Write a protein that binds this ligand. Structure first.
Ligand SMILES: O=[N+]([O-])c1ccc(O[C@@H]2O[C@H](CO)[C@@H](O[C@@H]3O[C@H](CO[C@H]4OC[C@@H](O)[C@H](O)[C@H]4O)[C@@H](O[C@@H]4O[C@H](CO[C@H]5OC[C@@H](O)[C@H](O)[C@H]5O)[C@@H](O[C@@H]5O[C@H](CO)[C@@H](O)[C@H](O)[C@H]5O)[C@H](O)[C@H]4O)[C@H](O)[C@H]3O)[C@H](O)[C@H]2F)c([N+](=O)[O-])c1
Length: 370
């Protein structure tokens, strides 16, 4: 015991308002939004340029057509590093935000995010035992504190764990088992709550190659799997050319350039996307396990001008419609990555500071795709 037990008030199993299976829950969610660069920001909730989450932002997200939110949360910067005790004020603030999302009729997925890298960059034998102790300490405290919410609240163990081979997968499987067991041990509605488990780097290919088994659960049929999607990188996140490839400015049948053809895609087009989602339909969906697509988005290139600017924005939108539609046909639940920015290379579709829509084009695209 590197840390004290934080499972000091376990409750009797309770299935009141927890009656859906993972499959039945997935059936109610077609379109999700990440509260990005907010509760997981290093230095505090407002340290990366966004305001504190408000009832009126969450009301906008619902009234705009979203069924759910993913809330990345930071934890380690708020904890005593001797005891792994998390600040009681932070635990109360996260509870308050969950309460507000549930009051607006959203499903809610809370995680431990990158969180400064303590677990995420450390999927190794050297770090396995200390990280298993922290994972257990933090999840005992988070689940105890959020124990009383109904099935609108889901928990996700990790974000994008850096596991690249089989030895790293075994280490991750251990991390994921410590999660499940910590949650169930606190015994509320947490006896039956749907938990979400992350594939290696939440990458589709690595997950296809390396994924073996889902963790063991005292509960029956209450697990989903998680991947993310920034494919192709050159289009969605690349901000400068390298020896190994060029930024793509344009995407999709119908929206390719005739004047500027090096800035069209050399790979990662409609058919590749179809192929990638199919791998997750076979491994998980066809086998009674829903798949959360926890993060996707291509960034705005508002440094372009003229017909270049207009063609980029037309393909950028189609990219978002196509991903959403094709994800949902295969049983993947699409959650849009929104960092809140409205400047060059950002992903915010709302203006957080005025609670208005900033990018009506991409919002329309996600809804048409849904
Ligand atoms: O071949 N594979 O196996 C394979 C694996 C992975 C691949 O792609 C990567 O997948 C991972 C997981 O999905 C991605 O991580 C998520 O990515 C989000 C978007 O990241 C980008 O945002 C914009 C750019 O800044 C940059 O391209 C990327 O970071 C990410 O959100 C961003 O979080 C930033 C903070 O970063 C910290 O936490 C995440 C962590 O990975 C990163 O190491 C760490 O530093 C935000 O940046 C901050 O912004 C504030 C405010 O302006 C500044 O003040 C700070 O200085 C600055 O740090 C950023 O704005 C936000 O969008 C999610 O947190 C994360 O889960 C990863 O991006 C993919 F690269 C691929 N593949 O080919 O794509 C293949």
């Amino acid at each position: 015991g590197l840390y004290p037990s934080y499972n000091t008030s376990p409750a009797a199993p309770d299935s009141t308002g927890m009656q859906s299976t993972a499959v039945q829950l997935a059936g109610k969610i077609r379109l999700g939004w990440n509260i990005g660069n907010t509760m997981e920001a290093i230095g505090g909730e407002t340290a990366w340029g966004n305001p504190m989450v408000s009832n009126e932002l969450l009301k906008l997200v619902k009234d705009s057509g979203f069924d759910a939110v993913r809330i990345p949360v930071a934890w380690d910067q708020y904890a005593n590093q001797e005891s792994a005790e998390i600040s009681a004020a932070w635990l109360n603030r996260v509870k308050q935000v969950v309460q507000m999302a549930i009051d607006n009729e959203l499903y809610v997925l809370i995680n431990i995010h990158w969180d400064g890298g303590w677990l995420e960059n450390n999927i190794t034998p050297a770090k396995k035992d200390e990280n298993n102790a922290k994972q257990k300490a933090f999840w005992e405290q988070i689940a105890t504190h959020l124990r009383d919410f109904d099935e609108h609240l889901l928990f996700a163990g990790t974000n994008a764990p850096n596991a690249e081979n089989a030895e790293q997968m075994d280490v991750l499987n251990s991390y994921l088992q410590t999660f499940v067991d910590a949650v169930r041990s606190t015994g509320g509605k947490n006896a039956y709550r749907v938990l979400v488990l992350q594939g290696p780097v939440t990458d589709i290919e690595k997950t296809n190659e390396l994924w073996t088994h889902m963790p063991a659960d005292t509960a029956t049929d209450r697990l989903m799997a998680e991947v993310h999607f920034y494919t192709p990188y050159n289009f969605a996140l690349m901000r400068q050319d390298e020896s190994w490839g060029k930024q793509f400015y344009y995407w999709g049948e119908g929206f390719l350039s005739t004047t500027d053809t090096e800035r069209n895609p050399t790979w990662g087009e409609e058919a590749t996307i179809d192929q990638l989602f199919d791998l997750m339909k076979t491994k998980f969906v066809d086998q009674g396990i829903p798949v959360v697509l926890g993060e996707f988005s291509a960034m705005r290139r508002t440094n372009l001008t003229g017909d270049a600017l207009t063609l980029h924005l037309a393909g950028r939108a189609y990219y978002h419609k196509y991903v959403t539609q094709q994800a949902l046909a295969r049983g993947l639940l699409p959650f849009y990555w929104d960092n809140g920015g409205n400047d060059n290379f950002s992903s915010g579709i709302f203006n957080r500071q005025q609670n208005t829509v900033f990018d009506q084009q991409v919002l329309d695209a996600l809804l048409e795709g849904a």
